[PDB]
Amino acid sequence: DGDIGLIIAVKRLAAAKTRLAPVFSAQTRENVVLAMLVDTLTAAAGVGSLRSITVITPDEAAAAAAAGLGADVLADPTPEDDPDPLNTAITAAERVVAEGASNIVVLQGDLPALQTQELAEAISAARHHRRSFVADRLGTGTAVLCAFGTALHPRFGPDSSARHRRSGAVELTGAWPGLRCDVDTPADLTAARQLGVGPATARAV
């Protein structure tokens, strides 16, 4: 059995992926965000090195979906006026997950084209470092952050790749297109769909 505690943080679905609003009705946009989480979780759950998957979210629909796939779920109590709610949530989940795992991996929940093998390989590569990350497709963001026997020090948000790099996290290379293809914009979604999205995202779009 595995040694990696995987964390995914998910914001309120109404707030999520607002740059997809031009191509989706609000209910369809929320459905796409949830479906991308489902496909990401499904791909991740195939990775043999995982001990657990923990989803932290204030969104009860996302909570139900994750729990319904056999993930651990943490309610996110982070106030609305917290200046950095994403990293606050990750750090909160980390404190819990750290009780049961020494090696923790934070994964974006909007990777609908993720293949199990891609994540497995990324984690194998990460084992050679204390802290490491995979940049997303366009290079400014972070698809995955990995910490082996040390604190994550997450710097997700704008310009996270650069911030992670500055923090001393080593950048992993490895094509892993499905791992890198996070979906923020319609262009990102087009790219993901060309790689091949999982069935939940296929249905939602």
Residue numbers in the entry: 7 to 211
Please, what does the article write about this entry?
In the second branch, it has been hypothesized that a 2-phospho-l-lactate guanylyltransferase (CofC in archaea and the putative enzyme FbiD in bacteria) catalyzes the guanylylation of 2-phospho-l-lactate (2-PL) using guanosine-5ʹ-triphosphate (GTP), yielding l-lactyl-2-diphospho-5ʹ-guanosine (LPPG). Mass spectrometry (MS) and protein crystallography are used to demonstrate that PEP guanylylation is catalyzed by the FbiD/CofC enzymes that were previously thought to act upon 2-PL.
To understand the molecular basis of PEP recognition by Mtb-FbiD, we crystallized the protein and solved the structure by selenium single-wavelength anomalous diffraction (Se-SAD), and then used this selenomethionine-substituted structure to obtain the native FbiD structure by molecular replacement. The latter was then refined at 1.99 Å resolution (R/Rfree = 0.19/0.22). FbiD has a cone-shaped binding cleft with a groove running across the base of the cone, formed by the C-terminal end of the central β-sheet. We speculate that the GTP binding site is not formed until FbiD/CofC interacts with FbiA/CofD, enabling catalysis to proceed through to formation of dehydro-F420-0.
